[PDB]
Amino acid sequence: EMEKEFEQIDKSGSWAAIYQDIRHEASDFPCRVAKLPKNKNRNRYRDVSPFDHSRIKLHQEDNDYINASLIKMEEAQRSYILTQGPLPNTCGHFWEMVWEQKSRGVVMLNRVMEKGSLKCAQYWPQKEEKEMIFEDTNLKLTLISEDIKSYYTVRQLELENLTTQETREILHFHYTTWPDFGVPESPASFLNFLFKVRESGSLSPEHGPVVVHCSAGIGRSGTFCLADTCLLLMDKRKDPSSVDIKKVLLEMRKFRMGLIQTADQLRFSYLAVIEGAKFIMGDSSVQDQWKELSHED
Ligand SMILES: O=C(O)c1ccc2cc(C(F)(F)P(=O)(O)O)ccc2c1
């Protein structure tokens, strides 16, 4: 049971050991394609690559590579696409993936500039009169509207396949206050954001996998996905005790490496899941409490 386990680990102060063991058990699969010479410039970080078995292939005869993985959670029946922050040369690929995978939402857990360095390209339009056109993938992207909150912004975008002129609505959820290798202000702050994504239908099975990313697409992205999945699992069963957080993370790591970068990010995952359990268990009011505590206004 996660809560008793949390108190135990917290009391013993062994989060570092717990986290280290997970890393020791983490799966190791080939990343041959990611390491191919022609893809070097398609990778942001040398040591963060997608496993060949779960990588997302771009539907193009030229080069189907993109540093992105499909985290297909069988038991929970939810899939996510974890990817790195797109590079200046991979923004068109990023949107090609969103189109081809039929994703409705994109969760950005990082900022374009963090710690004096550019951790992601500005792959989306910031002004409605300034739409973006990715000639390479033949896609056009337009900002339609945006809801700016204190620690996050939700943007409504329109992605158009210029080739077929088909149009789709993309919801962009941008958490702006989550430090790399850091954690959210509080479980309330995180859950308020997670539930904002849930309510949009972006995580629903009637859409392609939600695209989740940060700079590397593993730390903050891993934390977001683990919490959501653990909440989903106990939801379908309405049984919090049936969920084993560490086991869930290990299964996720069979699809992409390094999910959850710090022992504190793992610790926070427990906090977020424990708190979120309240809602899952029939206390819908907590959702409003999280909104208050998040100070989104
Ligand atoms: O160069 C590397 O080897 C490398 C490895 C892991 C990283 C993890 C993050 C993260 F955890 F903060 P993120 O949440 O963006 O996934 C950011 C940058 C990283 C860079």
UniProtKB/Swiss-Prot annotation:
Q: Which domain of life is it from?
A: Eukaryota
Q: Which residues carry this modification: Cysteine sulfenic acid (-SOH)?
A: C214
User: Could you tell me which cysteines form disulfide bridges?
Assistant: none
> Which of the residues bear the PTM Cysteine sulfinic acid (-SO2H)?
C214
Covalent cross-link N,N-(cysteine-1,S-diyl)serine (Cys-Ser), where: C214-S215
Q: Which residues carry this modification: Cysteine persulfide?
A: C214
Which residues in this protein are found as Phosphoserine?
Answer: S49, S241, S242
| Reaction catalysed by this enzyme | O-phospho-L-tyrosyl-[protein] + H2O = L-tyrosyl-[protein] + phosphate
Report the residues modified as S-nitrosocysteine.
C214
Active-site residues from the entry: C214 (phosphocysteine intermediate)
Please state every residue range assigned to the domain named Tyrosine-protein phosphatase.
Answer: 2-276
Positions annotated to bind substrate: D180, C214, S215, A216, G217, I218, G219, R220, Q261
Which molecular function GO terms apply here? cadherin binding; enzyme binding; ephrin receptor binding; insulin receptor binding; non-membrane spanning protein tyrosine phosphatase activity; protein kinase binding; protein phosphatase 2A binding; protein tyrosine phosphatase activity
GO cellular component: a single term: early endosome
Q: How does it assemble?
A: Interacts with EPHA3 (phosphorylated); dephosphorylates EPHA3 and may regulate its trafficking and function. Interacts with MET. Interacts with NCK1.
The entry's function note states: Tyrosine-protein phosphatase which acts as a regulator of endoplasmic reticulum unfolded protein response. Mediates dephosphorylation of EIF2AK3/PERK; inactivating the protein kinase activity of EIF2AK3/PERK. May play an important role in CKII- and p60c-src-induced signal transduction cascades. May regulate the EFNA5-EPHA3 signaling pathway which modulates cell reorganization and cell-cell repulsion. May also regulate the hepatocyte growth factor receptor signaling pathway through dephosphorylation of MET.
Q: What is this protein called?
A: Tyrosine-protein phosphatase non-receptor type 1
From what organism does this protein derive? Homo sapiens
Point out the gene that encodes the protein: PTPN1
| Full-protein residues shown | 2 to 298 of 435
